[PDB]
């Protein structure tokens, strides 16, 4: 007996939530690109070792771990498909700030995020085709957004390059600009948490299911651990290890929601309509825990 | 394709998009053009 709120899409609270999300993204990207250099980005582009290992880790671990979790946990056909689309999605921009929290060579982080988004728009239908075989004999190849991906990539790169230019041109705006941006980010985050709690209501109890919670808990943690292990095994720098892992662990869950909404009616995808939200909150919690653990470990090294 | 949504990296709902004029939140969201949805009779069957 799963029932969505009577007016979910059309409500002042939902429009407000979307507006604050957009503002959060813009200000986060501006204050996050305010700590990069063009020369380091060019150097990372000209040395594609880190980008290659990051892409290999993402597109060979996340879809594979989603498929293995779906097979092991004996999920339904729709449930096993929902996790698979999340696994095939590109790494989100949360990885950039998450790596910022661990001093992780931000130029490599932004390079990996951009190239991962491009390779996603290139090869996500291929991964879906070769991994979905067995569930949903349907196509699902024309449901992944294509122009939207590149438009979003450009629209998130614009504030990043604006911040980079601001840092390179005149640095005395940093203290005034950075603090304000941070303040905006904190206010927007508390507002977005409150608004999400208000909008979701008591309907979140329906989608928690022990299996859904379990898979959405292991998947980001498994991604983090596997990415770190692979980066360490490839004899990479300690700074690059953290960013590679915490990029391969994060995912862009908006694509999974949009594709599922386009392909299937809401009633078919009822209980797992909130799966992207569960993945987002679980990955946020695990990232915060990892950041706290790393900071405590660094405090031990003084 | 049939999907013309501008994804938001920090988004978890279909209406979380980067479109300036938030038509998704209005009463006529036109970001999806697939009325030929699949009911998937064996969606809830394991294997």
């Amino acid at each position, epitope marked *: *007996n799963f*029932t969505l709120p009577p007016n979910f899409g059309k409500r002042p609270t939902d429009l407000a939530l979307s507006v604050i999300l957009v503002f959060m993204l813009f200000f986060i990207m501006l204050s996050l690109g305010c700590t990069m250099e063009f020369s380091k980005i060019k150097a990372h582009l000209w040395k594609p070792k880190g980008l290659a290992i990051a892409l290999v880790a993402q597109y060979g671990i996340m879809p594979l771990t989603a498929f293995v979790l779906g097979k092991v946990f004996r999920l339904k056909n729709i449930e096993a498909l929902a996790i698979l689309v999340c696994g095939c999605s590109p790494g989100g921009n949360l990885s950039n700030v998450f790596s910022l929290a661990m001093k992780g060579d931000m130029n490599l982080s932004i390079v990996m995020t951009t190239c991962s988004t491009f390779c996603a728009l290139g090869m996500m239908p291929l991964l879906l085709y070769i991994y979905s075989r067995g569930i949903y004999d349907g196509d699902l190849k024309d449901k992944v957004p294509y122009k939207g991906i590149v438009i979003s990539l450009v629209l998130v790169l614009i504030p990043c390059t604006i911040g980079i230019v601001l840092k390179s041109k005149r640095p005395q705006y940093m203290r005034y600009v950075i603090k304000g941006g941070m303040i905006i980010i904190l206010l927007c985050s508390v507002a977005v948490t409150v608004l999400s709690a208000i909008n979701v209501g008591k309907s979140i109890m329906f989608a928690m299911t022990p299996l859904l919670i379990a898979t959405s808990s292991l998947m980001p943690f498994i991604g983090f651990l596997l990415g770190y292990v692979l980066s360490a095994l490839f004899c990479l720098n300690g700074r690059c290890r953290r960013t590679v892992s915490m990029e391969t662990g994060c995912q862009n869950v908006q694509l999974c929601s949009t594709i599922l909404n386009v392909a299937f009616p*809401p*009633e078919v995808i009822g209980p797992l309509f909130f799966f992207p939200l569960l993945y987002m909150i679980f990955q946020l919690g695990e990232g915060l825990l990892l950041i706290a653990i790393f900071w405590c470990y660094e405090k031990f090294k003084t | 394709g049939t999907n013309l949504s501008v994804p938001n990296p920090l988004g978890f709902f279909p209406d979380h998009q980067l479109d300036p004029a938030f038509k998704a939140n209005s009463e006529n969201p036109d970001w999806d053009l697939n*009325p*030929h949805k699949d*009911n*998937w*009779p064996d969606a*809830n069957k394991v294997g």
Partner: antibody
Amino acid sequence: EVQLQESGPELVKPGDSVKMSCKASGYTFTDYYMDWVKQNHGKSLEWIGYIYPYNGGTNYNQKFKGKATLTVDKSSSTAYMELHSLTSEDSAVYYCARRGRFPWLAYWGQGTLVTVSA
Amino acid sequence: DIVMTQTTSSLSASLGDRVTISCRASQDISNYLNWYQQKPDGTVRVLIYYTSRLHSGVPSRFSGSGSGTDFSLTISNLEPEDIATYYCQQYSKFPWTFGGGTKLEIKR
């Protein structure tokens, strides 16, 4: 072969609610949508709404939102429809249809005739 | 709300002649129209879905294709069993409206 059986003819005074039953058979029931279609005396069809048997999700037409409630009773595999406050304007045959895969009405019932008079 | 209109309310067909039932849409729907046949004793049956595909069971003589706002349903040779009321339904928008008015009869 899938076959749908309806409750039968009904006769209700104005303002007294009625219920329509649609006994599904020939398939496992809880994987296909059930849509209800109302035909006027002249012979013009209007789509009322649908119900998902697996979770009871419903969505009605704007006109019929006030006076249409859909239940499934998955144990007996017989969908129901209630009309609450019926006036003399609504009458004639109501059909239950089973939507198949893509959005088209595949198999229809024989139809239930409803007459409202005092 | 899309208003579905059918050009003719009653059509004469005789026997062994093909009748093209024309359905016109208020706005563009782009190949999201279905066809239904209602015999005189109720028993509504679906003939064509997605405007080009025959439902499993209907005779192969039923056909008809169209795109945009103009649609057709061809019957080819007409048997006495194919004397009924034919409806065109769209599902481009949620209300799912119907045509509602095409009837067939024998010429004499």
